[PDB]
Amino acid sequence: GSSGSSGTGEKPFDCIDCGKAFSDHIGLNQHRRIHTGEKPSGPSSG
Ligand SMILES: [Zn+2]
Fold this sequence. Notes:
Blueprint: H1 25-32
The structure holds zinc ion.
Protein name: Zinc finger protein 28 homolog
Function: May be involved in transcriptional regulation. May have a role in embryonic development.
Subcellular location: Nucleus
């Protein structure tokens, strides 16, 4: 849950996995580490 509409800023590196934002490639990739590794099991993903 994010607040504040105005004042978004520049963040081309936004995690598409969860929807986070980052102002640096390294910062983003380093964060994706939480998603990269474990995948959805079962008949369907979601
Ligand atoms: Zn993320």
